[PDB]
Design an enzyme around this catalytic site. Structure first.
Site, PDB file in Angstrom:
ATOM      1  CB  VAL A 108      -0.858   0.101   1.257  1.00  0.00           C
ATOM      2  CG1 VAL A 108      -2.245   0.548   0.880  1.00  0.00           C
ATOM      3  CG2 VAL A 108      -0.861  -1.213   2.004  1.00  0.00           C
TER       4      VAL A 108
ATOM      5  N   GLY B  98       7.580  10.733  -0.021  1.00  0.00           N
ATOM      6  CA  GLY B  98       7.712  11.413   1.254  1.00  0.00           C
ATOM      7  C   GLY B  98       8.659  12.593   1.320  1.00  0.00           C
TER       8      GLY B  98
ATOM      9  N   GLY C 214       7.966   2.910   3.649  1.00  0.00           N
ATOM     10  CA  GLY C 214       9.224   3.443   4.089  1.00  0.00           C
ATOM     11  C   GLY C 214       9.953   3.414   2.763  1.00  0.00           C
TER      12      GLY C 214
ATOM     13  CB  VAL D 279      10.077  -0.956   3.434  1.00  0.00           C
ATOM     14  CG1 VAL D 279       9.502  -2.370   3.539  1.00  0.00           C
ATOM     15  CG2 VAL D 279      10.579  -0.493   4.796  1.00  0.00           C
ATOM     16  CE1 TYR D 280       5.407   1.107   0.180  1.00  0.00           C
ATOM     17  CE2 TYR D 280       6.207   3.360   0.383  1.00  0.00           C
ATOM     18  CZ  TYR D 280       5.209   2.414   0.573  1.00  0.00           C
ATOM     19  OH  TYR D 280       4.014   2.757   1.172  1.00  0.00           O
ATOM     20  CB  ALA D 281      14.152   0.393  -2.221  1.00  0.00           C
TER      21      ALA D 281
ATOM     22  CD  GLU E 115     -10.687 -37.354  -5.763  1.00  0.00           C
ATOM     23  OE1 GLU E 115     -10.007 -36.534  -6.419  1.00  0.00           O
ATOM     24  OE2 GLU E 115     -11.782 -37.776  -6.167  1.00  0.00           O
TER      25      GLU E 115
ATOM     26  CD1 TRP F  81     -14.431 -39.818  -5.174  1.00  0.00           C
ATOM     27  CD2 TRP F  81     -15.257 -41.232  -6.704  1.00  0.00           C
ATOM     28  NE1 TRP F  81     -13.433 -40.080  -6.082  1.00  0.00           N
ATOM     29  CE2 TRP F  81     -13.911 -40.943  -7.033  1.00  0.00           C
ATOM     30  CE3 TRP F  81     -15.984 -42.101  -7.531  1.00  0.00           C
ATOM     31  CZ2 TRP F  81     -13.277 -41.489  -8.153  1.00  0.00           C
ATOM     32  CZ3 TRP F  81     -15.352 -42.649  -8.645  1.00  0.00           C
ATOM     33  CH2 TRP F  81     -14.008 -42.336  -8.945  1.00  0.00           C
TER      34      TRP F  81
ATOM     35  CE1 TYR G 160     -10.552 -41.651 -10.490  1.00  0.00           C
ATOM     36  CE2 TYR G 160      -8.373 -41.368 -11.445  1.00  0.00           C
ATOM     37  CZ  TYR G 160      -9.723 -41.119 -11.466  1.00  0.00           C
ATOM     38  OH  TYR G 160     -10.241 -40.334 -12.464  1.00  0.00           O
TER      39      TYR G 160
ATOM     40  CB  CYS H 195     -10.840 -38.514 -15.369  1.00  0.00           C
ATOM     41  SG  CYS H 195     -12.642 -38.713 -15.644  1.00  0.00           S
TER      42      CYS H 195
ATOM     43  NE  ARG I 221     -11.155 -42.089 -18.820  1.00  0.00           N
ATOM     44  CZ  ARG I 221     -12.425 -41.699 -18.838  1.00  0.00           C
ATOM     45  NH1 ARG I 221     -12.930 -41.079 -19.897  1.00  0.00           N
ATOM     46  NH2 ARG I 221     -13.193 -41.926 -17.784  1.00  0.00           N
TER      47      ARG I 221
ATOM     48  CG  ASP J 181     -16.097 -30.346 -16.390  1.00  0.00           C
ATOM     49  OD1 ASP J 181     -16.449 -30.063 -15.221  1.00  0.00           O
ATOM     50  OD2 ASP J 181     -16.579 -29.785 -17.405  1.00  0.00           O
TER      51      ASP J 181
HETATM   52  N1  LIG Z   1       3.396   7.992   0.512  1.00  0.00           N
HETATM   53  C1  LIG Z   1       3.433   6.858   1.260  1.00  0.00           C
HETATM   54  O1  LIG Z   1       2.570   5.985   1.009  1.00  0.00           O
HETATM   55  C2  LIG Z   1       4.456   6.711   2.302  1.00  0.00           C
HETATM   56  C3  LIG Z   1       5.411   7.776   2.507  1.00  0.00           C
HETATM   57  N2  LIG Z   1       6.369   7.580   3.519  1.00  0.00           N
HETATM   58  C4  LIG Z   1       7.320   8.691   3.668  1.00  0.00           C
HETATM   59  O2  LIG Z   1       8.631   8.159   3.475  1.00  0.00           O
HETATM   60  C5  LIG Z   1       9.560   8.777   4.324  1.00  0.00           C
HETATM   61  C6  LIG Z   1      10.099   7.646   5.249  1.00  0.00           C
HETATM   62  O3  LIG Z   1      11.016   6.838   4.439  1.00  0.00           O
HETATM   63  P1  LIG Z   1      12.486   6.505   4.981  1.00  0.00           P
HETATM   64  O4  LIG Z   1      13.211   7.665   5.541  1.00  0.00           O
HETATM   65  O5  LIG Z   1      13.101   5.562   3.989  1.00  0.00           O
HETATM   66  O6  LIG Z   1      12.052   5.589   6.217  1.00  0.00           O
HETATM   67  P2  LIG Z   1      11.560   4.128   6.478  1.00  0.00           P
HETATM   68  O7  LIG Z   1      10.181   4.256   7.043  1.00  0.00           O
HETATM   69  O8  LIG Z   1      11.861   3.242   5.401  1.00  0.00           O
HETATM   70  O9  LIG Z   1      12.564   3.697   7.709  1.00  0.00           O
HETATM   71  C7  LIG Z   1      13.918   3.392   7.395  1.00  0.00           C
HETATM   72  C8  LIG Z   1      14.416   2.717   8.654  1.00  0.00           C
HETATM   73  O10 LIG Z   1      13.892   1.345   8.632  1.00  0.00           O
HETATM   74  C9  LIG Z   1      15.006   0.515   9.009  1.00  0.00           C
HETATM   75  N3  LIG Z   1      15.539  -0.389   7.945  1.00  0.00           N
HETATM   76  C10 LIG Z   1      15.290  -0.385   6.549  1.00  0.00           C
HETATM   77  N4  LIG Z   1      15.962  -1.345   5.943  1.00  0.00           N
HETATM   78  C11 LIG Z   1      16.665  -2.004   6.911  1.00  0.00           C
HETATM   79  C12 LIG Z   1      17.567  -3.106   6.919  1.00  0.00           C
HETATM   80  N5  LIG Z   1      17.885  -3.721   5.793  1.00  0.00           N
HETATM   81  N6  LIG Z   1      18.113  -3.532   8.102  1.00  0.00           N
HETATM   82  C13 LIG Z   1      17.790  -2.900   9.267  1.00  0.00           C
HETATM   83  N7  LIG Z   1      16.951  -1.846   9.368  1.00  0.00           N
HETATM   84  C14 LIG Z   1      16.416  -1.442   8.139  1.00  0.00           C
HETATM   85  C15 LIG Z   1      16.045   1.385   9.695  1.00  0.00           C
HETATM   86  O11 LIG Z   1      15.848   1.530  11.103  1.00  0.00           O
HETATM   87  P3  LIG Z   1      16.913   2.030  12.081  1.00  0.00           P
HETATM   88  O12 LIG Z   1      17.233   3.439  11.766  1.00  0.00           O
HETATM   89  O13 LIG Z   1      16.259   1.871  13.382  1.00  0.00           O
HETATM   90  O14 LIG Z   1      18.156   1.153  11.960  1.00  0.00           O
HETATM   91  C16 LIG Z   1      15.870   2.566   8.834  1.00  0.00           C
HETATM   92  O15 LIG Z   1      16.649   3.746   9.109  1.00  0.00           O
HETATM   93  C17 LIG Z   1       8.744   9.791   5.135  1.00  0.00           C
HETATM   94  O16 LIG Z   1       8.909  11.115   4.601  1.00  0.00           O
HETATM   95  C18 LIG Z   1       7.323   9.289   5.140  1.00  0.00           C
HETATM   96  O17 LIG Z   1       6.403  10.360   5.267  1.00  0.00           O
HETATM   97  C19 LIG Z   1       6.413   6.404   4.313  1.00  0.00           C
HETATM   98  C20 LIG Z   1       5.492   5.392   4.107  1.00  0.00           C
HETATM   99  C21 LIG Z   1       4.543   5.562   3.116  1.00  0.00           C
HETATM  100  C1  LIG Z   2      -2.243   6.322   4.184  1.00  0.00           C
HETATM  101  C2  LIG Z   2      -1.020   6.142   3.257  1.00  0.00           C
HETATM  102  C3  LIG Z   2      -0.334   7.510   3.027  1.00  0.00           C
HETATM  103  N1  LIG Z   2      -1.545   5.758   1.906  1.00  0.00           N
HETATM  104  C4  LIG Z   2      -1.137   4.684   1.371  1.00  0.00           C
HETATM  105  N2  LIG Z   2      -1.637   4.392   0.172  1.00  0.00           N
HETATM  106  N3  LIG Z   2      -0.307   3.863   1.858  1.00  0.00           N
HETATM  107  C5  LIG Z   2       0.244   4.013   2.998  1.00  0.00           C
HETATM  108  N4  LIG Z   2       1.087   3.042   3.380  1.00  0.00           N
HETATM  109  N5  LIG Z   2      -0.059   5.114   3.778  1.00  0.00           N
HETATM  110  C6  LIG Z   2       0.551   5.132   5.036  1.00  0.00           C
HETATM  111  C7  LIG Z   2      -0.027   4.433   6.097  1.00  0.00           C
HETATM  112  C8  LIG Z   2       0.555   4.438   7.345  1.00  0.00           C
HETATM  113  C9  LIG Z   2       1.716   5.134   7.549  1.00  0.00           C
HETATM  114 CL1  LIG Z   2       2.420   5.133   9.097  1.00  0.00          CL
HETATM  115  C10 LIG Z   2       2.310   5.830   6.515  1.00  0.00           C
HETATM  116  C11 LIG Z   2       1.732   5.831   5.261  1.00  0.00           C
END
Ligand SMILES: NC(=O)C1=CN([C@@H]2O[C@H](COP(=O)(O)OP(=O)(O)OC[C@H]3O[C@@H](n4cnc5c(N)ncnc54)[C@H](OP(=O)(O)O)[C@@H]3O)[C@@H](O)[C@H]2O)C=CC1
Ligand SMILES: CC1(C)N=C(N)N=C(N)N1c1ccc(Cl)cc1
Ligand SMILES: NC(=O)C1=CN([C@@H]2O[C@H](COP(=O)(O)OP(=O)(O)OC[C@H]3O[C@@H](n4cnc5c(N)ncnc54)[C@H](OP(=O)(O)O)[C@@H]3O)[C@@H](O)[C@H]2O)C=CC1
Ligand SMILES: CC1(C)N=C(N)N=C(N)N1c1ccc(Cl)cc1
Lengths: 516, 516
Positions: free
Chosen positions: A26, A36, A156, A159-161, A295, A317, A343, A403, A423, A426
């Site tokens: 999401v 962000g 994050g 995370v998305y990456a 089955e 059956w 079977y 079958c 053989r 359906d």
């Molecule tokens: N538009 C949207 O739907 C969303 C937008 N955002 C926006 O994105 C920005 C946040 O992104 P970002 O700064 O990347 O932050 P993230 O929320 O991705 O947090 C990054 C942190 O997660 C941890 N982490 C990630 N990968 C690893 C790994 N391989 N091993 C250990 N820890 C890991 C670390 O924690 P630690 O530092 O504790 O080691 C790290 O610094 C904000 O501006 C937010 O508003 C965020 C979610 C959704």
């Molecule tokens: C609501 C919002 C911006 N919208 C989407 N589509 N996805 C997320 N993951 N969001 C989101 C939800 C929770 C948090 Cl903490 C950050 C972003």
């Protein structure tokens, strides 16, 4: 029976353990892809927020509220978890998994305002010192699978990456993206879907399933936005939909003696990947997997008494097991629902003399199944590893000819492959069932010989579509197939014959609704 | 009583409607055959080329005798063009299309009687068009005695050969193009373009095109040759599967060190319509062996000496006193393979003592039953026979490679699906496609049906390690048009059919692989 039975090996659980749990994503972005403003999202949108809330909290099947034994989880970076006001922390009704290399489960707890809350949210908050992968891994554990219905990558930038690249991308079942046409918010991080055919997409082809009409937010700037659900195109399930469509457009029409009509073509083949816990249960129409499971297990055990299926509430059956039908087959000496040497009996006792289903057959006839299990563990390249229930001698003695009457095993790179020969097929209800059945057999046989599940190939013979199925099978054709689910075993056995339907669980099966 | 009686529609099921031919022609850079009033260009090289192609026989050892010679079909106008002192074209059956001239008429046009009688045999008239001429060369008098038919001319005849129904019978087109100093022509030669309706699904391609040659005729006439053929996608099914296997297959090694490249699961379709015989052209298939063994199979034979006594030693290795003994088949006279193939086809499940026993009436006669269901209930989905009998393999010299086959009837045409577990792409597969096509064709004749399609399903498809280089050689050859199968005479029973009852006509495979 021990020696009559097939003893599962020690690696029984080693080549089927769920390495990584499947998940969805999401996210919200601006028309340029930004996500962000460093730590915040300068564009909070009412509608989108409610959507995230609903999407991530709700479960398949309405009328079921989340709970500690069945709920969804969310995985987020630390910086994201930090952007949630401590008062709304953690997101309720979901398992909040946080990625952090600095915070422990305990520390995140400490962060909540007071103790009470810290205790009330103890089973809803856990830290993982790693990225998405190590989190998806933690999730696949017995403790969370099947417990957690759906995992959602709530974001994050990092995370998305991790989610959009191998290996985690191969488990991403769906991408829910909200695109807000911000008035100006050009951030930093760009969220992009790998295009089809590029190296980035890693062979995956993302195609929209649904796209919302442009909408207007009730917010303060009448911001415009739209939604999109993206999924990894499923060529495999499409083979099937392609073949049904061809049978309907070009198949030959035939009505039997009953007046039963069908359209059909002759000769076809399909391939189904079975690697990394992949189960090819079709998504464009729910498949009766409990029926399928009971089955197949029923087969490998050499059963012939259908009542055992109809007792566990599986009635596939009954029609062919009744007294009336049996009488019409000349089996007036058979107990009702005593199909004869069909079977499974031919699988484990080929050519054995049959009397009644409750007789002792141990050691009788050729146990094809037991030899294939033994050849795979000593000479995996042997080209004669196949079983058949097509016995012209026993055939008249059977409720009816099988079958799915033939199957062959192939081994390469420690991966167990299985070829099927049906053989009569359906397409509507039979083919999907049979795909699940043999997929299961290859998995169970794989686990028994120390191999990893590979592929299921399916050779169709006379494959039809009932006339009474043309329209519904047409409606279904509309739907675009979703990602396949996965099957995991919660327990292993000592012998192949000991497995029960409950020993395993199908996770992440999101089949379209019943056709109207 | 035990034998399968042929119906009286026996001959009609596969009567050769039109015989297959080729077309030779000369044109100028505009497609000008000639000004309708005789070709204005005598390009010597072309004449010897024409003479060579239309006269010689494939057997690079036989001379054109009335018993075995090439035919030449032409329109009256083209026949007139031939100088009376040079009529008829020597060493070839001269076929002339005319609605006024008569077999005697053409003859009288020739001067001296010495040749007017020595050539009554090499001249014949047809009152109709090309289509009638091919239908006439298809009579038992000309097929198979005439090795090949050559449409040699007449704008009217060329036009007919290039359109249905005659095109579907055109095996190839030889075209010489001259640099015409004189544009004095009028009728243009044109090979239908790929994908256009005029092409009727046929895609014409060049097999050969020469470099620009210069005639020693004193005019420096620039000219070049072409050999276009109908694209044979069906053989490309097989050529592609080998390329894929060679290119990406799993390299495995026998326990004796023998290597193979392989893939599991594949399928191929082959059309058996209108006397089409799918004998690969990129490498000659031993048809005399195929035909004899199949017949050997249908008879339920178990003694290979009967096949080796006919110059077919394919079972000599598995018929060895040595091989036999390893199998513990110590009491089997040499060459007695045991209850393999044919025996399980006509006597499935019978106890086997020696090939000498009378088996009539024993076991299940899978073939008989199919032939019967076929004529009364062609839709039945249980018309398949298997050689795979687990209770009796241990008594077989060897287990069957092609172990299962099924039938399907649509629109009165008979289709057949073959299942082969191990598949030697190098020699077997090509041989096996031959056999089951023959088997399917004969079954049709026995059930008052027409040959439909043959579906080939494969299990372990492999290319033997030391065959890579040769197969790579073969893969460079563009597949040619498949040949045709015909029947000189018929039979009262199926078990009675002899190899010499059928003739394989128009088979022009490429020469042996230069395996130095
Ligand atoms: N538009 C949207 O739907 C969303 C937008 N955002 C926006 O994105 C920005 C946040 O992104 P970002 O700064 O990347 O932050 P993230 O929320 O991705 O947090 C990054 C942190 O997660 C941890 N982490 C990630 N990968 C690893 C790994 N391989 N091993 C250990 N820890 C890991 C670390 O924690 P630690 O530092 O504790 O080691 C790290 O610094 C904000 O501006 C937010 O508003 C965020 C979610 C959704
Ligand atoms: C609501 C919002 C911006 N919208 C989407 N589509 N996805 C997320 N993951 N969001 C989101 C939800 C929770 C948090 Cl903490 C950050 C972003
Ligand atoms: N450059 C080259 O490679 C070639 C050049 N040529 C030249 O082209 C010219 C060919 O003349 P063109 O008129 O195009 O064709 P043809 O030579 O085919 O002559 C047509 C004649 O063939 C007969 N004929 C055609 N169709 C039928 C039918 N359906 N039933 C019965 N008889 C039929 C007729 O004979 P009838 O009138 O008696 O009924 C008819 O008038 C010649 O001058 C020849 O020398 C020919 C071949 C090759
Ligand atoms: C020799 C020539 C011109 N060349 C080609 N390629 N084809 C023919 N059919 N020819 C031909 C042969 C005989 C006659 Cl009578 C007319 C043309």
């Amino acid at each position: 029976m021990s020696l009559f039975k097939i003893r599962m090996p020690e690696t029984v659980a080693e080549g089927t353990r769920l390495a990584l749990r499947a998940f969805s994503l999401v996210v919200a972005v601006d028309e340029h892809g930004g996500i962000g403003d460093g730590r915040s999202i300068p564009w909070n949108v009412p509608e989108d927020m409610k959507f995230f809330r609903d999407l991530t909290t709700k479960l398949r099947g309405k009328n079921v509220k989340p709970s500690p034994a069945k709920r969804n989880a969310v995985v987020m970076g630390r910086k994201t978890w930090d952007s949630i006001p401590p008062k709304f922390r953690p997101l309720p009704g979901r398992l909040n998994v946080v990625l952090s290399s600095t915070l422990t489960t305990q520390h995140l707890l400490d962060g909540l305002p007071d103790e009470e809350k810290r205790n009330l949210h103890a089973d809803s908050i856990v830290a993982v010192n790693g990225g998405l992968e190590q989190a998806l891994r933690l999730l696949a554990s017995p403790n969370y699978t099947p417990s957690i219905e759906t995992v959602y990558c709530i974001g994050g930038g990092s995370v998305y990456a991790e989610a959009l690249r191998p290996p985690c991308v191969h488990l991403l079942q769906a991408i829910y993206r909200t695109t807000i046409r911000a008035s100006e918010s050009s951030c930093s991080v760009f969220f992009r879907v790998p295009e089809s055919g590029t190296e980035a997409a890693a062979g995956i082809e993302w195609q929209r399933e649904t796209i919302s009409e442009e909408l207007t937010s009730a917010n303060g700037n009448e911001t415009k936005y739209y939604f999109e659900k993206l999924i990894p195109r499923n060529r495999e399930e499409e083979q099937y939909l392609s073949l049904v469509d061809r049978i309907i457009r070009e198949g030959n029409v035939k009505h039997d003696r009953t007046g039963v009509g069908t359209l059909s073509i002759f000769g076809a083949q399909m391939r189904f990947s079975l690697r990394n816990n992949r189960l090819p249960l079709l998504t464009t129409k729910r498949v009766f997997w409990r029926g399928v499971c009971e089955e197949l297990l029923w087969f490998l055990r050499g059963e012939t008494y259908a009542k055992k299926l109809s007792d566990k509430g599986v009635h596939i059956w009954d029609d062919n097991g009744s007294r009336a039908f049996l009488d019409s087959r000349g089996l007036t000496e058979y107990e009702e629902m005593d199909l004869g040497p069909v079977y499974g009996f031919q699988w484990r006792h080929f050519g054995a003399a049959y009397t009644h289903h409750d007789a002792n057959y141990d050691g009788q006839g050729v146990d094809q199944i037991k030899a294939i299990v033994e050849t795979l563990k000593t000479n995996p390249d042997d080209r004669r590893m196949l079983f058949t229930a097509w016995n012209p001698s026993a055939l008249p003695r059977m409720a009816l000819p099988p079958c799915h009457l033939l199957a062959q095993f192939y081994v390469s790179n420690g991966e167990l492959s299985c070829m099927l020969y049906q053989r009569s097929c359906d397409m509507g209800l039979g083919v999907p069932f049979n795909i699940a059945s043999y997929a299961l057999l290859t998995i169970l046989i794989a686990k028994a010989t120390g191999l990893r599940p590979g592929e299921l190939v399916h050779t169709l013979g006379d494959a039809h579509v009932y006339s009474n199925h043309v329209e519904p099978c047409n409606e279904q054709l509309k739907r675009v197939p979703r990602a396949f689910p996965y099957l995991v075993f919660r327990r292993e056995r000592e012998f192949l014959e000991d497995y029960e339907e409950g020993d395993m669980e199908v996770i992440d099966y999101a089949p379209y609704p019943p056709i109207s």
